[PDB]
Structure 1
């Protein structure tokens, strides 16, 4: 599998993955699917801020997964901290894609001079939690019942990675 920046041609493939995570998982906390327009607007807002959108792609340019990050919280104080997300196409799980994607994302965030990457994972998702811990992420939050989906309460686990521990001041 090849990792590269997303182009507008990749949006249809990204839409398929996104809408699946929406309807069958707790990787996204929305229950409503979106259209291509919605993902096009999202793609542009990202390019505007200088934030990357990476995709795991086929020789046949098929989208197997994608990753990206944006602001964590809407205040000037958190500009050094971004929140990312990685999604892999259902049939592609268990092949190491999430690792390749998350590793590439970390390198871009680091090249951008960013300071902290935050992951917001549903607590029961052991697969995702283990993937991150192996990449240096540490648990820093356990928030019970802050979310809901499929008719039940969901717990949130915050994991974070410091990209430059030697940097004493902003």
Structure 2
């Protein structure tokens, strides 16, 4: 049925299992080392101190997650946000990914952010099309910018526009 909720440091194990083959076997993440539960736990709670972090469950088991993160480091940038959506290594397609974004994106819009950015490791025709369907506009590509698993990978960036005027500080997310 794929129900959706805010993640908590308890799901850290299940998330860390979704992440393992993504790090070890793919170029979706550029992390070259699988993180531990102890630090996976930390990331969840550290994210939730400012950004949302969502989990998808099926039959009482996490089969995908999605989170928001800082785009760049200075204050002039605090209305851009980086969105990350991962799904299980078996059944999701897109799929669970679109259900995740359809919750995550609105929250973001309602928090005060102006543009959401997603970086895809090309080639990725599937994820590419999903973002375009959602209404992400392709804004550029950093070619050969990353070397993981004995290969150079082009990384394209898609932008989601929220729309606004006047300006005022983006707002956080509800506690645990």
TM-score by length of 1: 0.93
Match of 2:172 in 1: none
Q: Which whole-Å CA distance do the structure 2 matches of 1:169 and 1:158 have between them?
A: 26
Match of 1:88 in 2: 87
> How far is the alpha carbon of 1:69 from its aligned partner?
0.7
User: Which structure 2 residues correspond to residues 1-170 of structure 1 after superposition, within 5 A?
Assistant: 1-49=2-50, 51-59=51-59, 61-94=60-93, 96-164=95-163, 167-170=164-167
User: SS of the residue aligned with 2:113?
Assistant: coil
State how many pairs are aligned. 166
Q: Contact 2:80–2:114 at 8 Å: present in 1 too?
A: yes
Flag structure 2 segments of 5+ consecutive residues without an equivalent.
Answer: 168-176
Q: Which whole-Å CA distance do the structure 2 matches of 1:151 and 1:86 have between them?
A: 24
Q: Which whole-Å CA distance do the structure 2 matches of 1:39 and 1:108 have between them?
A: 23
Q: Contact 2:94–2:130 at 8 Å: present in 1 too?
A: no
Q: Contact 2:23–2:30 at 8 Å: present in 1 too?
A: yes
Q: Deviations over 1:19-58 (max 9, x none)?
A: 1210121110112101111111111211212x11101102
- Structure with more contact order per residue of length (Cα contacts < 8 Å, sep ≥ 6): 2
> How far is the alpha carbon of 1:93 from its aligned partner?
2.9
Stretch of structure 1 that moved more, 64-73 or 105-114: 105-114
User: SS of the residue aligned with 1:19?
Assistant: helix
> How far is the alpha carbon of 1:92 from its aligned partner?
2.0
> How far is the alpha carbon of 1:95 from its aligned partner?
5.6
Q: Deviations over 1:123-145 (max 9, x none)?
A: 20111111100000010011111
Flag structure 1 segments of 5+ consecutive residues without an equivalent.
Answer: none
Q: Deviations over 1:98-149 (max 9, x none)?
A: 0000111101101211111100101201111111000000100111111111
